[PDB]
Amino acid sequence: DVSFRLSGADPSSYGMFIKDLRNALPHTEKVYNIPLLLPSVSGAGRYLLMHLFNYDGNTITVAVDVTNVYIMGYLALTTSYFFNEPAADLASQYVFRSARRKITLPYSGNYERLQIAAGKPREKIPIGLPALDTAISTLLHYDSTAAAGALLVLIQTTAEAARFKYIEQQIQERAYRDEVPSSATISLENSWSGLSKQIQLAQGNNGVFRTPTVLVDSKGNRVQITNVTSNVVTSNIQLLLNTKNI
Ligand SMILES: O=c1ccn([C@@H]2O[C@H](CO)[C@@H](O)[C@H]2O)c(=O)[nH]1
Ligand SMILES: *[C@@H]1O[C@H](CO)[C@@H](O)[C@H](O)[C@H]1NC(C)=O
């Protein structure tokens, strides 16, 4: 398992949690020195538990699929909550079975569906450590509309930060003050799958992507990533989704 406490949290302790989260995801190889997530894992070993504690020390446990860093559901108090989708239903056979009741959330876990449920795009939702503390608190008591917004914060502050060092740094910059994500952040989130794929197709193609990936950079400009020498590849991305899942 991995753990993070908001009480006394700072950029360093958050860094340590995102490092622990990355190190808990298994891989048998690296592609251009980046961990390649596994094609598949069966049984309960598919799911990592993240224990998150709000500032008052209340806790939820979040279940993460180690092959794609997808949040499947979470346990709050004695009740479990799972996204409305077959992968989460499968997760519910393995994790949080000791819960006294199981609620299926009235949406699947992907950004588009969560934004609909929440009534707003994530361009308009501040993120940071304070927002993460709020999110954890929200998820302690069922409210599906509020939970959708909280899950957008949770996904971005945990999974997406694990995937990209840039997003980890963004959250670190938002340790004591929330701010809406940069367009670069949004872009990286939306391109993880594409980048993961192109980095893998690059091996066998002399480090050149078969199809370029269009990103927004720190300054707000659209740039085209064409090969593995780009900083997105050499410094930023920390985990690759296996092309077997693309
Ligand atoms: O059950 C799900 C489905 C999607 N996602 C997130 O939403 C993104 C797709 O919109 C994925 O990359 C992942 O970060 C989850 O966390 N859980
Ligand atoms: C590869 O990417 C670099 C760095 O972004 C770029 O300047 C260069 O022209 C690209 N080369 C090829 C062969 O795609």
PDB file of C-alpha atoms and ligand atoms in Angstrom:
ATOM      1  CA  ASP A   1       0.000   0.000   0.000  1.00  0.00           C
ATOM      2  CA  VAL A   2       0.939   3.632  -0.193  1.00  0.00           C
ATOM      3  CA  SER A   3      -0.083   6.470   2.038  1.00  0.00           C
ATOM      4  CA  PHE A   4      -0.322  10.259   2.121  1.00  0.00           C
ATOM      5  CA  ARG A   5      -1.267  12.541   5.009  1.00  0.00           C
ATOM      6  CA  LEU A   6      -2.419  16.092   4.413  1.00  0.00           C
ATOM      7  CA  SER A   7      -1.754  17.021   8.027  1.00  0.00           C
ATOM      8  CA  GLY A   8       1.686  18.625   7.972  1.00  0.00           C
ATOM      9  CA  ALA A   9       2.009  17.932   4.214  1.00  0.00           C
ATOM     10  CA  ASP A  10       4.480  20.004   2.232  1.00  0.00           C
ATOM     11  CA  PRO A  11       6.117  19.785  -1.247  1.00  0.00           C
ATOM     12  CA  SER A  12       8.616  17.278   0.037  1.00  0.00           C
ATOM     13  CA  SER A  13       6.171  14.885   1.726  1.00  0.00           C
ATOM     14  CA  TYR A  14       3.927  14.994  -1.331  1.00  0.00           C
ATOM     15  CA  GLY A  15       7.028  14.222  -3.507  1.00  0.00           C
ATOM     16  CA  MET A  16       7.720  11.183  -1.339  1.00  0.00           C
ATOM     17  CA  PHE A  17       4.135   9.963  -1.756  1.00  0.00           C
ATOM     18  CA  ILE A  18       4.239  10.355  -5.553  1.00  0.00           C
ATOM     19  CA  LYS A  19       7.588   8.493  -5.573  1.00  0.00           C
ATOM     20  CA  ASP A  20       6.059   5.692  -3.411  1.00  0.00           C
ATOM     21  CA  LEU A  21       3.049   5.557  -5.784  1.00  0.00           C
ATOM     22  CA  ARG A  22       5.301   5.169  -8.875  1.00  0.00           C
ATOM     23  CA  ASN A  23       7.484   2.566  -7.128  1.00  0.00           C
ATOM     24  CA  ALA A  24       4.475   0.474  -6.183  1.00  0.00           C
ATOM     25  CA  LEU A  25       3.488  -0.053  -9.852  1.00  0.00           C
ATOM     26  CA  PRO A  26       5.146  -3.151 -11.204  1.00  0.00           C
ATOM     27  CA  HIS A  27       7.066  -3.315 -14.449  1.00  0.00           C
ATOM     28  CA  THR A  28       9.487  -5.830 -15.928  1.00  0.00           C
ATOM     29  CA  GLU A  29      11.079  -3.410 -18.355  1.00  0.00           C
ATOM     30  CA  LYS A  30      11.840   0.192 -19.288  1.00  0.00           C
ATOM     31  CA  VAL A  31      11.402   1.718 -22.727  1.00  0.00           C
ATOM     32  CA  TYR A  32      13.799   4.690 -23.193  1.00  0.00           C
ATOM     33  CA  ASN A  33      14.447   4.462 -19.502  1.00  0.00           C
ATOM     34  CA  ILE A  34      10.728   4.872 -18.526  1.00  0.00           C
ATOM     35  CA  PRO A  35       8.908   2.131 -16.632  1.00  0.00           C
ATOM     36  CA  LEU A  36       6.584   0.159 -18.919  1.00  0.00           C
ATOM     37  CA  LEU A  37       3.426  -0.849 -17.131  1.00  0.00           C
ATOM     38  CA  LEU A  38       2.417  -4.438 -17.481  1.00  0.00           C
ATOM     39  CA  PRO A  39      -0.031  -5.701 -20.083  1.00  0.00           C
ATOM     40  CA  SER A  40      -2.077  -7.467 -17.485  1.00  0.00           C
ATOM     41  CA  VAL A  41      -2.098  -8.643 -13.876  1.00  0.00           C
ATOM     42  CA  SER A  42      -4.673 -11.105 -12.533  1.00  0.00           C
ATOM     43  CA  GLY A  43      -6.268 -11.418  -9.137  1.00  0.00           C
ATOM     44  CA  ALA A  44      -5.961  -8.983  -6.326  1.00  0.00           C
ATOM     45  CA  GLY A  45      -2.423  -8.036  -7.286  1.00  0.00           C
ATOM     46  CA  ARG A  46      -3.922  -5.909  -9.991  1.00  0.00           C
ATOM     47  CA  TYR A  47      -4.991  -3.280  -7.416  1.00  0.00           C
ATOM     48  CA  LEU A  48      -2.877  -0.909  -5.331  1.00  0.00           C
ATOM     49  CA  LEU A  49      -4.469   0.622  -2.217  1.00  0.00           C
ATOM     50  CA  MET A  50      -3.703   4.280  -1.490  1.00  0.00           C
ATOM     51  CA  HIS A  51      -4.493   5.389   2.054  1.00  0.00           C
ATOM     52  CA  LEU A  52      -5.265   9.074   2.043  1.00  0.00           C
ATOM     53  CA  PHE A  53      -5.787  11.154   5.200  1.00  0.00           C
ATOM     54  CA  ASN A  54      -7.354  14.543   5.353  1.00  0.00           C
ATOM     55  CA  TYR A  55      -6.064  17.272   7.578  1.00  0.00           C
ATOM     56  CA  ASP A  56      -8.197  16.051  10.534  1.00  0.00           C
ATOM     57  CA  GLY A  57      -6.885  12.577   9.993  1.00  0.00           C
ATOM     58  CA  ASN A  58     -10.004  10.956   8.472  1.00  0.00           C
ATOM     59  CA  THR A  59      -9.184   8.495   5.778  1.00  0.00           C
ATOM     60  CA  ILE A  60     -10.327   6.894   2.560  1.00  0.00           C
ATOM     61  CA  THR A  61      -8.594   4.028   0.818  1.00  0.00           C
ATOM     62  CA  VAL A  62      -8.483   4.317  -2.970  1.00  0.00           C
ATOM     63  CA  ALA A  63      -8.067   1.325  -5.276  1.00  0.00           C
ATOM     64  CA  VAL A  64      -5.790   1.820  -8.274  1.00  0.00           C
ATOM     65  CA  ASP A  65      -5.385  -0.538 -11.274  1.00  0.00           C
ATOM     66  CA  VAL A  66      -1.568  -0.979 -11.543  1.00  0.00           C
ATOM     67  CA  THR A  67      -1.615  -1.590 -15.269  1.00  0.00           C
ATOM     68  CA  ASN A  68      -3.066   1.840 -16.159  1.00  0.00           C
ATOM     69  CA  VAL A  69      -3.059   3.947 -12.905  1.00  0.00           C
ATOM     70  CA  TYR A  70      -6.910   4.186 -13.162  1.00  0.00           C
ATOM     71  CA  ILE A  71      -8.846   4.828 -10.011  1.00  0.00           C
ATOM     72  CA  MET A  72     -11.444   2.035  -9.719  1.00  0.00           C
ATOM     73  CA  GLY A  73     -13.186   2.990  -6.471  1.00  0.00           C
ATOM     74  CA  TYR A  74     -12.579   3.798  -2.854  1.00  0.00           C
ATOM     75  CA  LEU A  75     -13.598   2.863   0.670  1.00  0.00           C
ATOM     76  CA  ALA A  76     -14.957   5.519   2.996  1.00  0.00           C
ATOM     77  CA  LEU A  77     -16.059   4.524   6.479  1.00  0.00           C
ATOM     78  CA  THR A  78     -17.790   1.132   6.124  1.00  0.00           C
ATOM     79  CA  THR A  79     -19.050   1.736   2.566  1.00  0.00           C
ATOM     80  CA  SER A  80     -17.288   1.142  -0.759  1.00  0.00           C
ATOM     81  CA  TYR A  81     -17.822   3.148  -3.920  1.00  0.00           C
ATOM     82  CA  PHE A  82     -17.044   2.000  -7.496  1.00  0.00           C
ATOM     83  CA  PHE A  83     -17.319   3.617 -10.864  1.00  0.00           C
ATOM     84  CA  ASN A  84     -20.176   2.407 -13.088  1.00  0.00           C
ATOM     85  CA  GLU A  85     -18.054   0.471 -15.609  1.00  0.00           C
ATOM     86  CA  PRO A  86     -16.970  -3.163 -16.125  1.00  0.00           C
ATOM     87  CA  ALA A  87     -13.375  -2.699 -14.988  1.00  0.00           C
ATOM     88  CA  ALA A  88     -14.535  -1.284 -11.629  1.00  0.00           C
ATOM     89  CA  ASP A  89     -17.150  -3.989 -11.224  1.00  0.00           C
ATOM     90  CA  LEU A  90     -14.297  -6.464 -11.651  1.00  0.00           C
ATOM     91  CA  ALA A  91     -12.204  -4.574  -9.100  1.00  0.00           C
ATOM     92  CA  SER A  92     -15.095  -4.891  -6.636  1.00  0.00           C
ATOM     93  CA  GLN A  93     -14.607  -8.652  -6.616  1.00  0.00           C
ATOM     94  CA  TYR A  94     -11.151  -8.166  -5.114  1.00  0.00           C
ATOM     95  CA  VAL A  95     -11.005  -5.018  -3.009  1.00  0.00           C
ATOM     96  CA  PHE A  96     -13.028  -3.643  -0.085  1.00  0.00           C
ATOM     97  CA  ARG A  97     -15.165  -6.795   0.244  1.00  0.00           C
ATOM     98  CA  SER A  98     -15.299  -6.236   4.004  1.00  0.00           C
ATOM     99  CA  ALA A  99     -17.395  -3.040   3.384  1.00  0.00           C
ATOM    100  CA  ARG A 100     -20.854  -3.174   4.940  1.00  0.00           C
ATOM    101  CA  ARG A 101     -22.399  -1.831   1.704  1.00  0.00           C
ATOM    102  CA  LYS A 102     -21.298  -1.183  -1.801  1.00  0.00           C
ATOM    103  CA  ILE A 103     -22.480   1.811  -3.770  1.00  0.00           C
ATOM    104  CA  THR A 104     -21.958   2.042  -7.511  1.00  0.00           C
ATOM    105  CA  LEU A 105     -21.439   5.663  -8.471  1.00  0.00           C
ATOM    106  CA  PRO A 106     -23.819   6.850 -11.187  1.00  0.00           C
ATOM    107  CA  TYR A 107     -21.025   7.488 -13.716  1.00  0.00           C
ATOM    108  CA  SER A 108     -17.909   5.881 -15.184  1.00  0.00           C
ATOM    109  CA  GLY A 109     -14.416   7.241 -14.246  1.00  0.00           C
ATOM    110  CA  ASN A 110     -13.237   9.053 -17.354  1.00  0.00           C
ATOM    111  CA  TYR A 111     -12.734  12.745 -17.510  1.00  0.00           C
ATOM    112  CA  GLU A 112     -15.575  13.476 -19.917  1.00  0.00           C
ATOM    113  CA  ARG A 113     -18.189  11.643 -17.847  1.00  0.00           C
ATOM    114  CA  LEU A 114     -16.892  13.080 -14.516  1.00  0.00           C
ATOM    115  CA  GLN A 115     -16.984  16.638 -15.876  1.00  0.00           C
ATOM    116  CA  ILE A 116     -20.590  16.126 -16.972  1.00  0.00           C
ATOM    117  CA  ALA A 117     -21.501  14.802 -13.520  1.00  0.00           C
ATOM    118  CA  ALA A 118     -19.700  17.635 -11.839  1.00  0.00           C
ATOM    119  CA  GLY A 119     -21.225  20.319 -14.075  1.00  0.00           C
ATOM    120  CA  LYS A 120     -17.854  21.789 -15.042  1.00  0.00           C
ATOM    121  CA  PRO A 121     -14.675  21.087 -16.981  1.00  0.00           C
ATOM    122  CA  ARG A 122     -11.522  20.555 -15.077  1.00  0.00           C
ATOM    123  CA  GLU A 123     -10.093  23.751 -16.537  1.00  0.00           C
ATOM    124  CA  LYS A 124     -12.322  25.426 -13.978  1.00  0.00           C
ATOM    125  CA  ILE A 125     -11.563  23.224 -10.974  1.00  0.00           C
ATOM    126  CA  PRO A 126      -8.642  24.291  -8.759  1.00  0.00           C
ATOM    127  CA  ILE A 127      -6.156  21.607  -7.745  1.00  0.00           C
ATOM    128  CA  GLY A 128      -3.399  21.481  -5.169  1.00  0.00           C
ATOM    129  CA  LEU A 129      -2.946  20.009  -1.682  1.00  0.00           C
ATOM    130  CA  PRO A 130      -5.763  22.067  -0.161  1.00  0.00           C
ATOM    131  CA  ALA A 131      -8.098  20.815  -2.913  1.00  0.00           C
ATOM    132  CA  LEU A 132      -6.989  17.244  -2.210  1.00  0.00           C
ATOM    133  CA  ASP A 133      -7.831  17.670   1.452  1.00  0.00           C
ATOM    134  CA  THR A 134     -11.337  18.937   0.411  1.00  0.00           C
ATOM    135  CA  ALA A 135     -11.767  16.047  -1.993  1.00  0.00           C
ATOM    136  CA  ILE A 136     -10.930  13.414   0.617  1.00  0.00           C
ATOM    137  CA  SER A 137     -13.364  15.111   2.960  1.00  0.00           C
ATOM    138  CA  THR A 138     -16.080  15.154   0.311  1.00  0.00           C
ATOM    139  CA  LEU A 139     -15.721  11.484  -0.428  1.00  0.00           C
ATOM    140  CA  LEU A 140     -16.263  10.559   3.247  1.00  0.00           C
ATOM    141  CA  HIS A 141     -20.015  11.162   2.754  1.00  0.00           C
ATOM    142  CA  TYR A 142     -21.870  10.206  -0.334  1.00  0.00           C
ATOM    143  CA  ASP A 143     -23.000  13.006  -2.595  1.00  0.00           C
ATOM    144  CA  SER A 144     -22.595  11.943  -6.239  1.00  0.00           C
ATOM    145  CA  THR A 145     -22.416  15.436  -7.746  1.00  0.00           C
ATOM    146  CA  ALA A 146     -19.881  16.685  -5.241  1.00  0.00           C
ATOM    147  CA  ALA A 147     -17.987  13.369  -5.431  1.00  0.00           C
ATOM    148  CA  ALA A 148     -17.469  13.804  -9.256  1.00  0.00           C
ATOM    149  CA  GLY A 149     -15.593  17.092  -8.671  1.00  0.00           C
ATOM    150  CA  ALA A 150     -13.649  15.573  -5.804  1.00  0.00           C
ATOM    151  CA  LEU A 151     -12.644  12.611  -8.040  1.00  0.00           C
ATOM    152  CA  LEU A 152     -11.365  15.012 -10.734  1.00  0.00           C
ATOM    153  CA  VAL A 153      -9.112  16.507  -8.094  1.00  0.00           C
ATOM    154  CA  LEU A 154      -8.064  13.126  -6.734  1.00  0.00           C
ATOM    155  CA  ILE A 155      -7.184  11.630 -10.153  1.00  0.00           C
ATOM    156  CA  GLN A 156      -5.115  14.639 -11.117  1.00  0.00           C
ATOM    157  CA  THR A 157      -3.291  14.959  -7.811  1.00  0.00           C
ATOM    158  CA  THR A 158      -2.398  11.224  -7.553  1.00  0.00           C
ATOM    159  CA  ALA A 159      -2.443   9.286 -10.866  1.00  0.00           C
ATOM    160  CA  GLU A 160      -1.572  12.160 -13.177  1.00  0.00           C
ATOM    161  CA  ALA A 161       1.199  13.409 -10.921  1.00  0.00           C
ATOM    162  CA  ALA A 162       2.570   9.804 -10.843  1.00  0.00           C
ATOM    163  CA  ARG A 163       2.537   9.785 -14.666  1.00  0.00           C
ATOM    164  CA  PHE A 164       4.211  13.177 -15.223  1.00  0.00           C
ATOM    165  CA  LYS A 165       6.866  14.970 -13.287  1.00  0.00           C
ATOM    166  CA  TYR A 166       5.534  18.259 -14.613  1.00  0.00           C
ATOM    167  CA  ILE A 167       2.115  17.644 -12.970  1.00  0.00           C
ATOM    168  CA  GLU A 168       3.810  16.543  -9.702  1.00  0.00           C
ATOM    169  CA  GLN A 169       5.689  19.911  -9.786  1.00  0.00           C
ATOM    170  CA  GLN A 170       2.431  21.783 -10.487  1.00  0.00           C
ATOM    171  CA  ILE A 171       0.842  20.245  -7.399  1.00  0.00           C
ATOM    172  CA  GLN A 172       3.948  21.017  -5.344  1.00  0.00           C
ATOM    173  CA  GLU A 173       3.615  24.630  -6.439  1.00  0.00           C
ATOM    174  CA  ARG A 174      -0.007  24.447  -5.172  1.00  0.00           C
ATOM    175  CA  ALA A 175       0.841  23.071  -1.709  1.00  0.00           C
ATOM    176  CA  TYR A 176      -0.747  25.918   0.228  1.00  0.00           C
ATOM    177  CA  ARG A 177      -2.862  27.558  -2.472  1.00  0.00           C
ATOM    178  CA  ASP A 178      -5.066  25.837  -5.061  1.00  0.00           C
ATOM    179  CA  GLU A 179      -5.054  26.849  -8.702  1.00  0.00           C
ATOM    180  CA  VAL A 180      -6.740  25.558 -11.828  1.00  0.00           C
ATOM    181  CA  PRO A 181      -4.391  23.277 -13.823  1.00  0.00           C
ATOM    182  CA  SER A 182      -2.244  24.772 -16.628  1.00  0.00           C
ATOM    183  CA  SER A 183      -3.330  23.993 -20.177  1.00  0.00           C
ATOM    184  CA  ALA A 184      -0.010  22.064 -20.430  1.00  0.00           C
ATOM    185  CA  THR A 185      -1.219  19.902 -17.541  1.00  0.00           C
ATOM    186  CA  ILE A 186      -4.551  19.294 -19.273  1.00  0.00           C
ATOM    187  CA  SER A 187      -2.671  18.430 -22.484  1.00  0.00           C
ATOM    188  CA  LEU A 188      -0.368  15.883 -20.829  1.00  0.00           C
ATOM    189  CA  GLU A 189      -3.364  14.230 -19.153  1.00  0.00           C
ATOM    190  CA  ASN A 190      -5.183  13.974 -22.434  1.00  0.00           C
ATOM    191  CA  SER A 191      -2.067  12.657 -24.259  1.00  0.00           C
ATOM    192  CA  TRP A 192      -0.802   9.977 -21.875  1.00  0.00           C
ATOM    193  CA  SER A 193      -2.094   7.094 -23.904  1.00  0.00           C
ATOM    194  CA  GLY A 194      -0.872   8.606 -27.189  1.00  0.00           C
ATOM    195  CA  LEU A 195       2.573   9.350 -25.803  1.00  0.00           C
ATOM    196  CA  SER A 196       2.901   6.003 -24.210  1.00  0.00           C
ATOM    197  CA  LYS A 197       2.065   4.427 -27.530  1.00  0.00           C
ATOM    198  CA  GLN A 198       4.382   6.560 -29.634  1.00  0.00           C
ATOM    199  CA  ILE A 199       7.297   6.092 -27.258  1.00  0.00           C
ATOM    200  CA  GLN A 200       6.843   2.336 -27.642  1.00  0.00           C
ATOM    201  CA  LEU A 201       6.490   2.553 -31.499  1.00  0.00           C
ATOM    202  CA  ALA A 202       9.661   4.617 -31.510  1.00  0.00           C
ATOM    203  CA  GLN A 203      11.665   1.453 -30.528  1.00  0.00           C
ATOM    204  CA  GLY A 204      12.124  -0.091 -33.935  1.00  0.00           C
ATOM    205  CA  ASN A 205      11.788   3.304 -35.582  1.00  0.00           C
ATOM    206  CA  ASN A 206      15.122   4.874 -34.529  1.00  0.00           C
ATOM    207  CA  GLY A 207      13.507   6.886 -31.741  1.00  0.00           C
ATOM    208  CA  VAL A 208      11.022   8.553 -34.152  1.00  0.00           C
ATOM    209  CA  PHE A 209       7.253   8.564 -33.389  1.00  0.00           C
ATOM    210  CA  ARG A 210       5.032   7.004 -36.175  1.00  0.00           C
ATOM    211  CA  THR A 211       2.499   9.783 -35.481  1.00  0.00           C
ATOM    212  CA  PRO A 212       3.417  13.103 -33.797  1.00  0.00           C
ATOM    213  CA  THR A 213       1.731  14.085 -30.561  1.00  0.00           C
ATOM    214  CA  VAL A 214       0.437  17.703 -30.182  1.00  0.00           C
ATOM    215  CA  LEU A 215       0.950  19.221 -26.712  1.00  0.00           C
ATOM    216  CA  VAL A 216       0.494  22.645 -25.130  1.00  0.00           C
ATOM    217  CA  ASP A 217       3.787  23.801 -23.506  1.00  0.00           C
ATOM    218  CA  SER A 218       4.344  25.770 -20.249  1.00  0.00           C
ATOM    219  CA  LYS A 219       3.959  29.100 -22.060  1.00  0.00           C
ATOM    220  CA  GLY A 220       0.589  28.145 -23.712  1.00  0.00           C
ATOM    221  CA  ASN A 221       1.874  27.270 -27.242  1.00  0.00           C
ATOM    222  CA  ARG A 222       0.854  24.098 -29.199  1.00  0.00           C
ATOM    223  CA  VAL A 223       3.980  22.079 -30.016  1.00  0.00           C
ATOM    224  CA  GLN A 224       4.428  18.883 -31.862  1.00  0.00           C
ATOM    225  CA  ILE A 225       6.406  16.024 -30.244  1.00  0.00           C
ATOM    226  CA  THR A 226       8.064  13.831 -32.948  1.00  0.00           C
ATOM    227  CA  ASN A 227      10.759  11.817 -31.299  1.00  0.00           C
ATOM    228  CA  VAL A 228      12.290  10.599 -28.045  1.00  0.00           C
ATOM    229  CA  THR A 229      14.790  13.515 -27.695  1.00  0.00           C
ATOM    230  CA  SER A 230      11.974  15.784 -26.590  1.00  0.00           C
ATOM    231  CA  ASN A 231      11.979  16.807 -22.899  1.00  0.00           C
ATOM    232  CA  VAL A 232       8.484  15.357 -22.478  1.00  0.00           C
ATOM    233  CA  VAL A 233      10.092  11.997 -23.085  1.00  0.00           C
ATOM    234  CA  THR A 234      13.533  12.456 -21.442  1.00  0.00           C
ATOM    235  CA  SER A 235      12.462  14.303 -18.284  1.00  0.00           C
ATOM    236  CA  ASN A 236       8.656  14.435 -17.798  1.00  0.00           C
ATOM    237  CA  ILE A 237       6.735  11.210 -18.441  1.00  0.00           C
ATOM    238  CA  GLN A 238       7.378   8.590 -15.639  1.00  0.00           C
ATOM    239  CA  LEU A 239       5.161   5.659 -16.630  1.00  0.00           C
ATOM    240  CA  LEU A 240       4.036   4.136 -19.920  1.00  0.00           C
ATOM    241  CA  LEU A 241       0.738   2.538 -20.584  1.00  0.00           C
ATOM    242  CA  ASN A 242       1.525  -0.761 -22.393  1.00  0.00           C
ATOM    243  CA  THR A 243       0.356  -0.647 -26.084  1.00  0.00           C
ATOM    244  CA  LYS A 244      -1.434  -3.922 -25.363  1.00  0.00           C
ATOM    245  CA  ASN A 245      -3.982  -1.687 -23.584  1.00  0.00           C
ATOM    246  CA  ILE A 246      -4.222   0.831 -26.540  1.00  0.00           C
TER     247      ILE A 246
HETATM  248  O1  LIG B   1     -12.220   4.265 -14.138  1.00  0.00           O
HETATM  249  C1  LIG B   1     -11.480   5.191 -14.508  1.00  0.00           C
HETATM  250  C2  LIG B   1     -11.554   5.687 -15.815  1.00  0.00           C
HETATM  251  C3  LIG B   1     -10.711   6.747 -16.172  1.00  0.00           C
HETATM  252  N1  LIG B   1      -9.845   7.271 -15.261  1.00  0.00           N
HETATM  253  C4  LIG B   1      -8.961   8.399 -15.558  1.00  0.00           C
HETATM  254  O2  LIG B   1      -9.538   9.201 -16.572  1.00  0.00           O
HETATM  255  C5  LIG B   1      -8.655   9.210 -17.696  1.00  0.00           C
HETATM  256  C6  LIG B   1      -9.436   9.039 -19.001  1.00  0.00           C
HETATM  257  O3  LIG B   1     -10.352  10.117 -19.103  1.00  0.00           O
HETATM  258  C7  LIG B   1      -7.665   8.082 -17.478  1.00  0.00           C
HETATM  259  O4  LIG B   1      -6.400   8.384 -18.057  1.00  0.00           O
HETATM  260  C8  LIG B   1      -7.541   8.014 -15.992  1.00  0.00           C
HETATM  261  O5  LIG B   1      -6.614   9.006 -15.575  1.00  0.00           O
HETATM  262  C9  LIG B   1      -9.781   6.738 -13.947  1.00  0.00           C
HETATM  263  O6  LIG B   1      -8.965   7.197 -13.099  1.00  0.00           O
HETATM  264  N2  LIG B   1     -10.618   5.724 -13.618  1.00  0.00           N
HETATM  265  C1  LIG B   2      13.140  15.589 -32.890  1.00  0.00           C
HETATM  266  O1  LIG B   2      12.777  16.416 -31.794  1.00  0.00           O
HETATM  267  C2  LIG B   2      13.682  17.505 -31.609  1.00  0.00           C
HETATM  268  C3  LIG B   2      13.479  18.066 -30.197  1.00  0.00           C
HETATM  269  O2  LIG B   2      12.166  18.562 -29.963  1.00  0.00           O
HETATM  270  C4  LIG B   2      13.479  18.435 -32.831  1.00  0.00           C
HETATM  271  O3  LIG B   2      14.160  19.694 -32.717  1.00  0.00           O
HETATM  272  C5  LIG B   2      14.002  17.669 -34.059  1.00  0.00           C
HETATM  273  O4  LIG B   2      13.985  18.469 -35.239  1.00  0.00           O
HETATM  274  C6  LIG B   2      13.199  16.369 -34.212  1.00  0.00           C
HETATM  275  N1  LIG B   2      13.792  15.441 -35.174  1.00  0.00           N
HETATM  276  C7  LIG B   2      13.112  14.489 -35.869  1.00  0.00           C
HETATM  277  C8  LIG B   2      13.978  13.673 -36.792  1.00  0.00           C
HETATM  278  O5  LIG B   2      11.894  14.257 -35.779  1.00  0.00           O
END
